[PDB]
Amino acid sequence: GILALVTDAVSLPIDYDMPPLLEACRTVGITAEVCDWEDGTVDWSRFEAVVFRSPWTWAERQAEFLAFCERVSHVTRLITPMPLVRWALDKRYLADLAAHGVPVIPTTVVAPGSDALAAVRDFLAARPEAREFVVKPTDGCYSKDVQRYQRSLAEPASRHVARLLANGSHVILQPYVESVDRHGETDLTFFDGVYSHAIHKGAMLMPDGTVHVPTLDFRQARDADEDQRAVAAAALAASVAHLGLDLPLVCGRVDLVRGADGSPMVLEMELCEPSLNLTFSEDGALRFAQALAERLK
């Protein structure tokens, strides 16, 4: 019952979770092997199951990674089955969350083939109150191609949008949530539908155009309040219901931001290959290994 933990050379160095996850696996008796999804020498048929941990370059070659996952599902069991994978790797899931009553950041999806500039202008027209907005691909991570713009910069942003559509990605337009500048965001980690821990992550989009990447210095242990955990758990339940999942998500991370209302709303959610912040909790890794141990029974 060897367990494959998927990563890739470029991403393994920033997967702070792998070291502690491997020890936890050791503690629950499961033999895990770290595998690069682009390593053609891997016989995926050898594994009992596979878990996608940090194949984070998928953001650079989405179709390629999705194809990889698809091919792997034929030779071995995926802890996160394909339906979940395709759905979790596209921020369009924010609309499904909204349909389930889960509070999310007002989100507008621009599909390939759309008029980039018109799309941006209609967006700003519908939200005359948004002083700034953000452009981002629905299929990305680690701040990839994410940018902040003052509403007067529609044309430049439309060019950013066009660049993304050209690569065949859907683009999401959202108003810039003002509280993020001073209160960043809160990322909650769950295991089998149960809250484990959270962290605070500083803002990534600087007013001066700088776009940061969530490195360790941008994170710190945080205790999510009732409301935040309540929203996070709703987002997860909505995901379980939407996909018809028989079991809770082995693990997941729900990122929340503060609205003007003060109440929390989902920024993004990671259910396929999330950074879990295991090293910021005293038993998060054990809870993850245990949840995995239950799936392998």
Ligand X SMILES: Nc1ncnc2c1ncn2[C@@H]1O[C@H](COP(=O)(O)OP(=O)(O)O)[C@@H](O)[C@H]1O
State the binding partner of 250 from Mg ion, ligand X, none, CB within 5 to 8 A by kind. none
Percentages (nearest 5) of helix, strand, coil residues in the chain: 40, 25, 35
Coil, strand or helix at 189: strand
The answer to whether residue 84 forms part of the interface with ligand X (CB under 6 A) is: no
Count the Cβ atoms, other than its own, within 10 Å of residue 290.
15
Q: Which tokens sit at 101?
A: 């009553």
Ramachandran category for residue 174: left, alpha or beta (phi over 0 → left; psi -120 to 50 → alpha)? beta
- Our CB check for ligand X shows the closer of 5 and 141 to be 141
User: What x/- string results for residues 107 through 146 when contact with ligand X is judged by CB under 6 A?
Assistant: ---------------------------x-x---xxxxx-x
CA atoms within 13 A on the CB side of 260: 7
- Our CB check for ligand X shows the closer of 138 and 289 to be 138
CB of 185 to ligand X, least distance (A): 6
Q: Which residues are catalytic?
A: 219, 253, 270
The answer to whether residue 177 forms part of the interface with Mg ion (CB under 5 A) is: no
Restricting to residues 91-110, name those near Mg ion by CB under 5 A.
none
Count the Cβ atoms, other than its own, within 10 Å of residue 145.
17
Residue 53 in contact with residue 18, Cβ under 8 Å?
A: yes
Q: Is 72 annotated as a binding residue?
A: no
Q: Partners of 270 in the beta sheet?
A: 253
Q: Is 134 annotated as a binding residue?
A: no
- Our CB check for Mg ion shows the closer of 139 and 268 to be 268
CB of 126 to ligand X, least distance (A): 15
CA atoms within 13 A on the CB side of 169: 26
For the annotated binding site for ATP, the residues are: 91, 136, 143, 174-175, 177
> Which residues are at the interface with ligand X (CB under 6 A)?
105, 134, 136, 140-144, 146, 174, 176-177, 180, 185, 203-205, 267-268
